[PDB]
A paper describes a structure:
Inhibition of butyrylcholinesterase (BChE) and p38α mitogen-activated protein kinase (p38α MAPK) offers an innovative dual approach to mitigate two major drivers of neurodegeneration in AD: cholinergic deficit and neuroinflammation. Using structure-based drug design and a library of known p38α MAPK inhibitors, we developed first-in-class, selective dual BChE/p38α MAPK inhibitors with balanced activity against both targets. The X-ray crystal structures of the two most promising molecules bound to both enzymes were solved. Structure-based design of MTDLs that simultaneously inhibit p38α MAPK and hBChE led to the identification and subsequent optimization of the first dual inhibitors of these two AD-related target enzymes.
Compounds 94 and 95 showed balanced submicromolar inhibitory potency against hBChE and p38α MAPK, while they did not inhibit AChE at a concentration of 100 μM, which was also one of the main objectives to diminish potential side effects. Compounds 94 and 95 showed high selectivity for p38α MAPK. The KINOMEscan assay showed that off-target inhibition was limited only to structurally related kinases (p38β MAPK, JNK1/2/3, and CDK3) and was absent at 1 μM, where only p38α MAPK was inhibited among the 103 kinases tested. The bulky isobutyl and cyclohexylmethyl groups occupy HR II, delineated by Val30, Ile108, Gly110, Ala111, and Asp112. The 2,4-difluorobenzene sits in HR I defined by Ala51, Lys53, Leu75, Ile84, Leu104, Thr106, and Leu167. The optimal distance of 7.9 Å between the hydrogen bond donor on the indazole core (i.e., the N 2 nitrogen of the indazole) and the 2,4-difluorobenzyl group allows exquisite selectivity toward the structurally and phylogenetically most related kinases. The amide group is critical for effective inhibition of p38α MAPK as it acts as a hydrogen bond donor interacting with Asp168 of the DFG pocket (3.2 Å for compound 94 and 3.6 Å for compound 95). The tertiary amine (i.e., the dimethylamine group) faces the solvent, which explains the retention of p38α MAPK inhibition when this functional group was not present. A statistically significant difference was noted in the latency to NW zone entry between the LPS-treated control group and mice treated with LPS and 95 (p < 0.05). Considering this, it can be concluded that the test compound 95 positively affected spatial memory retention measured in the MWM task.
Numbering used by the authors: 5 to 170, 185 to 353
Write the structure that this text describes.
Amino acid sequence: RPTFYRQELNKTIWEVPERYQNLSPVGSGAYGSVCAAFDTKTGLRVAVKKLSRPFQSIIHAKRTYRELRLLKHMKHENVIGLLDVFTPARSLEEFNDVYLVTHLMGADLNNIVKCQKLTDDHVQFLIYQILRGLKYIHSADIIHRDLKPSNLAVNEDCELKILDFATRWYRAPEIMLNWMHYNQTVDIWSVGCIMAELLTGRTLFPGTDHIDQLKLILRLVGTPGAELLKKISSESARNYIQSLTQMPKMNFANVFIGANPLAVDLLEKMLVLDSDKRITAAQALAHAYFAQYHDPDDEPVADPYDQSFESRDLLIDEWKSLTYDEVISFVPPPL
Ligand SMILES: CN(C)CCNC(=O)c1cc2c(cnn2CC2CCCCC2)cc1Cc1ccc(F)cc1F
Ligand SMILES: Fc1ccc(-c2n[nH]cc2-c2ccncc2)cc1
């Protein structure tokens, strides 16, 4: 066991190993509290997240276990991974706090898309890396569910990482309709919304609520056709759609004028209303828009990921002991 030092940062208190120095608050909210730090063992600038009340309730305890299992499994250049996980407690009885460590990135995509306007080549490379990370995530039967600029970080090399899994302007419309069985291409919808925003500098669907959001989407891609209507079980959904002033699929080349025709074509394949017809991450990496970057032998998939715990009804102490197990079995990655 290493040796710890303590401090108060904002109103959070922090107990971390000596190796992590110069902790500076980066922001805080539901997830927990995040500090930037300098790792003296490796020389890396790292990001340290202290979970908020990880074992306060069954939902918190399960969510804590979920996040740690996920982060420990992701080993991919475009997906955040675990550099380290530690607790100050020396026993399971005292175990009450969890800190997670990952590489610190330079800026989030929210601060690139406002502070400058992005060239087509940057858009190619950035979307390529998202899709490459998404191919790996999806190959593990994992859905991100919350892809958006603020959950994407880039360094000065323009290298990109997807972070923090799970009216929202980037959410697939089958969720605005509350369909219970949405699939992994909800993430592709979000990528479509993001790439559109990098090309125009404007939010694509800046809706004010679930209803306004769906209306902005249908104005671009048009009302659902009969093949898609046949798949909607919800009678209220079905009725609301059949009794809207019907609208045609706009031509995307008109909407996204001046954009590379290949970027427009890919956008048409991502922002399809019917989720069964949406392009997948693996197929999108092979789209000609990414010819400059696509390499089928350097777009790996993930080892299988056991998500059986998701269906379990356990006590707080059981979720907590399972989390402790995962802290101790952690093997840092080869430096
Ligand atoms: C909307 N999100 C923000 C929710 C909260 N996520 C983070 O604050 C976060 C951001 C991260 C990183 C890494 N690089 N950057 C990009 C930032 C860095 C500060 C300013 C420039 C851009 C990590 C984490 C969170 C985090 C995850 C896992 C982990 F093991 C430790 C963690 F710390
Ligand atoms: F208006 C819309 C918008 C999206 C959809 C949709 N796309 N993919 C799947 C669905 C869907 C929606 C509701 N119920 C089942 C399936 C259906 C109607």
